[PDB]
């Protein structure tokens, strides 16, 4: 029997797939059923081997539900199981999350030389914050200057400058320092003026600290009290650092710089000096999915570490805490020299008088080329920061350097010192054009060394195109003195008499006629020769991914080559516009550089977009990862229910209610469901009410946008969501204020229930309604009067005041005998027994309706209907107030109970983003219908197990018409029957996508079959030839490409019209994860998949739905399964993660959603002009968490593209 149970898991998970990420144990069996006679007969027969079938009825992951049927050889059922529920031995955790999904985070090849984000400029209020305190002092500032510096010496010499160590001179000079701003008539009145600022934003923390420290600097002025503890426990200095819109924007720029650096250099060993409380650590490390291999939280004092251990627990796996005195050598302090990729000095270099020596120490800890990010004071401005800065106990330690305090080093003098202490100078800066960023302007520098060389033979191939000719001439002119060879075409290279075998190649061929457009001209043998003679190579492509898919096929071939020949440096440079120089030489010399032990990375694949270089990196797309994993555990995401559909969904077991994402993900069916109105719900009824046998609908009230008019309306939704999409037939559009906020929804709900009760029964002459809401009682009486049905009211709390546990004799005595139907609306189940007794006393065969028959938590019209409903409601609106039982959706979800429904209760949906931005329980991408019933979905090459599973899932999710295509579509007709049982007509086309004639014949046969127009394509034809390019043959290249390349070309040409009446909802091309990283022996496959990727990208750029899924090893289904390659891929699992059949369905679903979203954003003028804008289209998948321990086995671990996907190392 336990093996029979294991059969459920087997149906749920295939061997080697790991869909069983947690140990499920049978927790709740709905119904076993055993035939003891047959079981004993089988046991005594001696065969002791019986057949079995099993359905994994529920598989979302939170708990598996299965039905088992074990039978004898004669097929007699010995025993069966129904909804056996295996629940995890322990609840699933984030550690059990499947991180297969990933996105091409496209980020700069180098941090911006000037962090100039407009969002982080000195806003007008800040440019009124600081200038107001300037106005206080601007009158005699030129005379105050020196005096101000004296005031700033309060740590070192102010108590000696005017004998201010004496309290009389204290009361004199401290107030004189404050008057260095308050002198021009403001005097003590400035205290009020300061408050006038503190009242609002952009000036609160800074000037508030000015007030709080100036009022108490007297003891500190004599060097007695603590300069900043004068306000208890750093009342606002942390607030000054974190919130001030003069200090704050510098920290935002620091986060931007750190994000760019960690993106370009992944798995950086990060050391933050001056972290202190961690405000800068919070800002920079808050970047989503930044590549930290190890974050060494650091400060001169260990006291903050505990707080860090509380603030940065999520990063504790990668984060380690160690103190560093920048004034002291780090190696003496235990830090490994030159063992850090990046260091972040957060406004702490001014706290050390050994600035140059501290920066030399930072160099000592940084690896060559490491990135130093400095937030520090610069370009002093007297009228803006004197008070608080002039106090601290070590900020003036540094006047030994020569200027006031540790000088407000200008970025020029910063560059001078930084170069002197062994760095590359000021590589980046923060926009400091006007003001307010001088105290914290951030700078980025490299730990310069032998470093880049801004010798091996160089060979240029291409240059045929006029732009290619120009770029070849520019290469010749700009290249340093090197041996040079030149060839117009790669075929000419094949004709070359002599080539150097350690050559560095620069290939402009892709700018010219592409290799993959003319492989039949021996260009493939020429490529073999190029690989043989090449030790380094750089290819140049002209917008390969968005305009030239053949160039992208070349990119994929070279991507796989980089794996096949690791000694062969491979680089690709994709330029959105070739006419827009000087960088291909840089990348070639970079390839000549092979500093493996230094921070600088290879840059395997660069893209020149918008006049700047960028690189892609695979980062776990936490959005779709969360969507997939929500199927298995309660994943919560910060969602704005005001603008995003959020449904107050009941639990599967109806345990309680929770907010979940209700996103329909752009289902295009709004024609048969004509004019589906979008209602932004303000108030709703938690429970769905049955409506004249049409079904159960949640009564909702809220706005509808009509010409930007927020017209109030009341409707019968089907999801109970902040935002609903409901047909107009279920909407009452009048903006009647009598149907007040919440109250009106309550009354309309009550009348929906009452009209349901009157209608479903109407036939009867008298009915009884038990324990209805008082409003419900009055409205039921009104409805009975209008319809002429004698309605009696009974309440267990005029009404027939019954009582729970009443005797049947008492009910006979009191209950009227004319009743023909009973309507039990008692939300509390205690009355249930009473109801049963009523069935004994009332008329025999009396119709019975429970609260579940009129109110429910699951849903899965004449205008006269709502007209009558509102008319009846208007008969009794004054019965109660507007907010009778109003509660916020959050409160209801937190405290509501399905078993105890609260009828006549109204959820108040928040409408402001701040009010509505809530932790919402993420919903699976395929939880809702994703496909239209009036369209054919064409799965090309998807006739195998993978394609058949995808098709059955499609029909399970709205695809009523599916067309599997294959040159040999071996599918059982009975399987078509089975999928028809699911509610969709599935057919096999026998279409060979390699030939235009075959594709046209198949598409015409679709019309012959009278199928709807093709609304989507799932292009996954596959032919594999595991062979090395040097050992590969051009026939193999064509064999693997044409099914992919020519197939996508033919289908795109057939569906390249965006103005057609039936544009494809999606064009999903099944790419392999090798397309994103390469794979030895599969450069053919990777090039084909990259052609697919580029066709999808350029098709989206053309205004047509498309996307690609870079699938890993599909164990449950696909060639890996029929060929029995599960063990082979498991042996290389650390390289390619397992994608389950249903996880593959989820990936395809998210790709379809991405295509539809891209199309809609194009309706919102998203251009997708470059590769940087189409990361969402390519759903990277199948890359497991890369364990550094397996770095040796992982042939691509050295590739920075996967940098964010690496596991902690220590």
Catalytically annotated residues:
2
CB of 683 to a copy of itself, least distance (A): 24
CB of 740 to a copy of itself, least distance (A): 30
Beta bridge partners of 1113: 1138
Provide the 3-class DSSP secondary structure of residue 245. coil
CB of 846 to a copy of itself, least distance (A): 9
Asked if 1022 is part of the footprint of ligand NAP (rule: CB under 6 A), the reply reads yes
Asked if 1114 is part of the footprint of ligand NAP (rule: CB under 6 A), the reply reads yes
Beta bridge partners of 650: 657
Asked if 1043 is part of the footprint of ligand NAP (rule: CB under 6 A), the reply reads yes
Of 674, 696, 683, 658, residue with least CA distance to 739:
683
407 versus 1020: smaller Cβ distance to ligand NAP? 1020
CB of 1075 to ligand NAP, least distance (A): 8
Provide the 3-class DSSP secondary structure of residue 43. helix
Report the C-alpha gap between 818 and 435 in whole angstroms. Answer: 86
Our CA angle for 246, 249, 250, nearest 5°, is: 90
> Which partner from the list other proteins, a copy of itself, ligand NAP, none does 1187 bind, CB cut-off 5 to 8 Å by kind?
none
**Token code pair at residue 1182:** 């199948």
CB of 81 to a copy of itself, least distance (A): 8
Map residues 929-968 to x or -, x wherever contact with a copy of itself holds by CB under 8 A. ----------------------------------------
Of 890, 887, 647, 689, residue with least CA distance to 773:
689
CB of 59 to a copy of itself, least distance (A): 12
480 versus 833: smaller Cβ distance to other proteins? 833
Report the C-alpha gap between 428 and 111 in whole angstroms. Answer: 7
405 versus 720: smaller Cβ distance to a copy of itself? 720
CB of 1039 to ligand NAP, least distance (A): 8
CB of 1137 to ligand NAP, least distance (A): 10
393 versus 1125: smaller Cβ distance to other proteins? 1125
Report the C-alpha gap between 778 and 526 in whole angstroms. Answer: 89
Give the DSSP H/E element, type plus range, for residue 699: strand 695-706
Asked if 1108 is part of the footprint of ligand NAP (rule: CB under 6 A), the reply reads no
Asked if 941 is part of the footprint of ligand NAP (rule: CB under 6 A), the reply reads yes
Contact 173, 180 (CB under 8 A): no
Contact 258, 142 (CB under 8 A): no
Map residues 52-91 to x or -, x wherever contact with a copy of itself holds by CB under 8 A. ---x-x---------x------------x-xx--------
> Which partner from the list other proteins, ligand NAP, a copy of itself, none does 696 bind, CB cut-off 5 to 8 Å by kind?
a copy of itself
816 versus 1185: smaller Cβ distance to a copy of itself? 816
> Which partner from the list other proteins, ligand NAP, a copy of itself, none does 14 bind, CB cut-off 5 to 8 Å by kind?
other proteins
Report the C-alpha gap between 666 and 931 in whole angstroms. Answer: 9
Map the footprint of ligand NAP across residues 1063-1082, applying CB under 6 A: 1070-1073
Beta strands in 59-176 (DSSP E): 64-71, 77-88, 103-108, 114-115
Distance of CA 113 to the CA centre of its chain: 28
Report the C-alpha gap between 1152 and 537 in whole angstroms. Answer: 36
Distance of CA 331 to the CA centre of its chain: 40
386 versus 1021: smaller Cβ distance to ligand NAP? 1021
706 versus 828: smaller Cβ distance to other proteins? 828
> Which partner from the list ligand NAP, a copy of itself, other proteins, none does 57 bind, CB cut-off 5 to 8 Å by kind?
a copy of itself
Quickly tell me which residue has 């001169």 as its tokens: 300
Judged by CB under 6 A, which of 242, 536, 924, 943 binds ligand NAP?
943
Map the footprint of a copy of itself across residues 730-789, applying CB under 8 A: 760
Spell out the long-range contacts of 987-992 with Cβ–Cβ below 8 A and sequence spacing 24 or more.
987/962, 987/963, 987/1011, 988/943, 988/963, 988/964, 989/938, 989/963, 989/964, 989/965, 990/965, 990/966, 991/940, 991/965, 991/966, 991/967, 992/966, 992/967
Of 1150, 652, 1156, 663, residue with least CA distance to 920:
663
Report the C-alpha gap between 217 and 828 in whole angstroms. Answer: 67
Residues that bind other proteins (CB under 8 A): 14, 29, 33, 35, 38, 51, 53, 69, 71, 75-80, 802-803, 805-807, 810, 829-830, 833, 945, 948, 972, 974-975, 978, 1116-1117, 1121-1122
In degrees rounded to 5, what are phi and psi of residue 228? -115, -20
What are the respective helix, strand and coil percentages of the chain, to the nearest 5? Answer: 40, 20, 40
Asked if 31 is part of the footprint of a copy of itself (rule: CB under 8 A), the reply reads yes
Map the footprint of a copy of itself across residues 804-863, applying CB under 8 A: 805, 807-810, 813, 817, 820, 833, 843-845, 847, 853, 856, 858-860
Of 78, 80, 77, 72, residue with least CA distance to 7:
80
> Which partner from the list other proteins, a copy of itself, ligand NAP, none does 856 bind, CB cut-off 5 to 8 Å by kind?
a copy of itself
Report the C-alpha gap between 359 and 376 in whole angstroms. Answer: 13
407 versus 1112: smaller Cβ distance to ligand NAP? 1112
Provide the 3-class DSSP secondary structure of residue 295. strand
**Token code pair at residue 225:** 């009290």
Binding site for ligand NAP (CB under 6 A): 941, 943-944, 946-947, 966-968, 992-994, 1020-1023, 1043, 1047, 1070-1073, 1111-1114, 1118-1120
Binding site for a copy of itself (CB under 8 A): 31, 33, 55, 57, 67, 80, 82-83, 690, 693, 695-696, 760, 805, 807-810, 813, 817, 820, 833, 843-845, 847, 853, 856, 858-860, 981, 983
């Amino acid at each position: 029997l336990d093996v029979a149970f294991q059969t459920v898991i087997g149906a749920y998970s295939s061997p080697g797939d790991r869909r069983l990420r947690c140990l499920y144990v049978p927790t709740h069996v709905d119904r076993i059923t055993l035939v003891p006679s047959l079981c004993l007969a089988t046991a005594e027969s001696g065969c002791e081997k019986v057949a079995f079938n099993t359905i994994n009825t529920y598989d979302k992951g939170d708990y598996l539900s299965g039905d088992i049927v074990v039978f004898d050889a004669e097929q007699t059922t010995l025993f069966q199981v129904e909804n056996i529920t295996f629940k995890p031995f322990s609840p699933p955790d984030a550690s059990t999350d499947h991180a297969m999904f990933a996105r091409w985070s496209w980020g700069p090849l180098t941090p911006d030389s000037l962090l100039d984000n407009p969002e982080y400029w000195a806003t007008a209020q800040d440019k009124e914050a600081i200038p107001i305190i300037e106005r206080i002092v601007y009158f005699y500032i030129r005379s105050f200057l020196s005096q101000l510096t004296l005031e700033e010496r309060q740590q070192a010499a102010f108590h000696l400058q005017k004998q201010i160590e004496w309290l009389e001179q204290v009361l004199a000079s401290a107030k004189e320092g404050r008057h260095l701003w308050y002198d021009p008539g403001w005097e003590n009145d400035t205290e009020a003026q300061i408050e006038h600022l503190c009242t609002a934003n952009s000036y609160h923390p800074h000037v508030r600290l000015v007030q709080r420290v100036g009022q108490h600097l007297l003891p500190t002025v004599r060097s007695n009290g603590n300069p900043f503890d004068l306000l208890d426990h750093d009342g606002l200095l942390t607030e000054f650092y974190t919130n001030t819109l003069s200090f704050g924007p510098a920290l935002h720029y620091a986060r931007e710089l750190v994000a760019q650096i960690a993106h370009r250099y992944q798995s950086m060993d990060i050391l933050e000096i001056g972290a202190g409380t961690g405000g800068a650590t919070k800002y920079v490390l808050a970047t989503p999915q930044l590549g930290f291999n190890s974050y060494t939280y650091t400060d001169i004092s260990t006291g903050f570490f505990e707080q860090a251990r509380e603030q940065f627990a999520p990063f504790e796996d990668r984060m380690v805490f160690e103190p560093l005195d920048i004034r002291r050598s780090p190696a003496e302090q235990g830090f490994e020299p030159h063992a850090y990729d990046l260091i972040i000095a957060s406004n702490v270099l001014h706290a050390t008088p050994d600035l140059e020596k501290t920066m030399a120490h930072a160099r000592s800890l940084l690896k060559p080329g490491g990135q130093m990010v400095i937030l520090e004071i610069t370009h002093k401005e007297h009228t803006r920061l004197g008070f608080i800065f002039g106090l601290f106990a070590d900020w003036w330690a540094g006047v030994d350097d020569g200027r006031c305090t540790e000088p407000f080093v200008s970025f020029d003098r910063w560059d001078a010192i930084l170069k002197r202490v062994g760095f590359s100078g000021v590589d980046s800066r923060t926009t400091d054009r006007d003001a307010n960023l001088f105290p914290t302007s951030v700078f980025s520098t490299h730990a310069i060394d032998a470093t880049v060389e801004y010798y091996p033979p160089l060979v240029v191939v291409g240059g045929q195109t006029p732009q290619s000719q120009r770029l070849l001439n520019d290469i010749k002119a700009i290249m340093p003195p090197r041996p040079l060879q030149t060839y117009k075409r790669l075929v000419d290279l094949l004709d070359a008499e002599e080539l150097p075998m350690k050559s560095t190649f620069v290939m402009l061929t892709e700018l010219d006629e592409e290799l993959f457009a003319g492989l039949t001209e021996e260009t493939f043998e020429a490529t073999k020769l190029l690989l043989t003679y090449a030790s380094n190579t750089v290819w140049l492509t002209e917008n390969a991914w968005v305009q030239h898919p053949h160039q992208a096929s070349t990119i994929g071939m070279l991507r796989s080559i980089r794996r096949e020949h690791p000694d062969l440096g491979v680089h690709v440079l994709d330029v959105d516009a070739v006419e827009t120089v000087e960088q291909v030489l840089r990348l070639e010399e970079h390839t000549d550089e092979l500093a493996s032990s230094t921070t600088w990375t290879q840059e395997p694949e660069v893209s020149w977009c918008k006049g700047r270089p960028w690189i892609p990196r695979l980062k776990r797309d936490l959005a779709r990862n969360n969507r997939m994993n929500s199927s298995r555990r309660p994943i919560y995401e910060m969602i704005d229910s005001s603008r995003a559909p959020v449904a107050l969904q009941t639990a599967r077991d109806s345990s309680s209610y929770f907010l979940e994402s209700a996103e329909t993900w752009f289902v295009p069916e709004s024609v048969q469901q004509m004019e589906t109105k979008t209602i932004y719900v303000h108030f709703s009824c938690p429970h769905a009410l049955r409506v004249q046998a049409l079904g159960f609908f949640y009564l909702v009230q809220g706005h509808v946008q009509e010409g930007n008019r927020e017209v109030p309306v009341v409707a019968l939704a089907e999801r109970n969501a902040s935002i609903v999409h409901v047909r107009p037939d279920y909407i009452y559009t009048e903006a009647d204020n009598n149907l007040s906020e919440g109250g009106g929804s309550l009354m309309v709900t009550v009348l929906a229930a009452a009209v349901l009760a009157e209608t479903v029964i109407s036939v009867t002459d008298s009915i009884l309604v038990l324990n209805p809401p008082s409003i419900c009682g009055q409205m039921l009486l009104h409805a009975g009067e209008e319809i002429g049905l004698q309605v009696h009211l009974a309440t267990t709390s005029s009404w027939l005041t019954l009582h729970a546990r009443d005797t049947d004799w008492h009910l006979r005595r009191v209950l009227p005998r004319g009743v023909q139907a009973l309507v039990d609306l008692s939300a509390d189940q205690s009355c249930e027994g009473l109801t049963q007794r009523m069935m004994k006393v009332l008329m025999p065969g009396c119709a019975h309706y429970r609260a579940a028959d009129l109110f429910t938590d699951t849903v899965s019209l004449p205008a006269a209907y709502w007209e009558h409903v509102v008319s009846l409601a208007r008969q009794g609106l004054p019965s109660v107030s507007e907010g009778w039982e109003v509660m916020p959706c959050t409160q209801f979800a937190a405290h509501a109970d399905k078993t105890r429904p609260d009828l006549s209760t109204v959820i108040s949906w928040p409408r402001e983003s701040d009010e509505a931005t809530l932790p919402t329980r993420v919903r699976s991408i395929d939880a809702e219908t994703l496909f239209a019933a009036d369209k054919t979905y064409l799965l090309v090459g998807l006739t195998g197990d993978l394609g058949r599973s995808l098709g059955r899932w499609m029909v399970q999710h709205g695809a009523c018409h599916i067309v599997l295509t294959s040159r040999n579509p071996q599918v059982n007709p009975k399987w078509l029957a089975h999928v028809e049982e699911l509610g969709g007509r599935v057919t096999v086309l026998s279409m060979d996508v390699t030939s235009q004639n075959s594709v046209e014949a198949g598409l015409a046969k679709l019309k012959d079959l009278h199928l709807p127009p093709v609304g989507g394509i799932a292009f996954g034809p596959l032919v594999l030839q595991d062979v090395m390019l040097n050992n590969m043959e051009l026939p193999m290249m064509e064999m693997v490409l044409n099914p992919k390349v020519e197939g996508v070309r033919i289908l795109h040409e057939k569906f390249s019209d965006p103005t057609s009446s039936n544009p494809l909802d999606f064009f999903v091309m099944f790419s392999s994860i090798v397309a994103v990283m390469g794979n030895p022996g599969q450069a053919n496959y990777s090039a084909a998949n990259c052609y697919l990727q580029a066709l999808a990208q350029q098709r989206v750029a053309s205004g047509l739905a498309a996307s690609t899924i870079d699938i890993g090893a599909v164990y449950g289904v696909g060639f890996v399964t029929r060929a029995e390659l599960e063990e082979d891929f498991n042996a290389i699992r650390f390289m390619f993660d397992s994608v389950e059949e249903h996880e593959l369905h989820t990936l395809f679903a998210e790709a379809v959603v991405a295509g539809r979203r891209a199309v809609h954003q194009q309706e919102q003028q998203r251009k997708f002009a470059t590769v940087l804008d189409m990361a969402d289209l390519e759903l990277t998948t199948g890359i497991p968490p890369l364990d550094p321990a397996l770095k040796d086995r992982i042939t691509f671990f050295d590739d920075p593209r996967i940098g964010n996907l690496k596991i902690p190392e220590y």
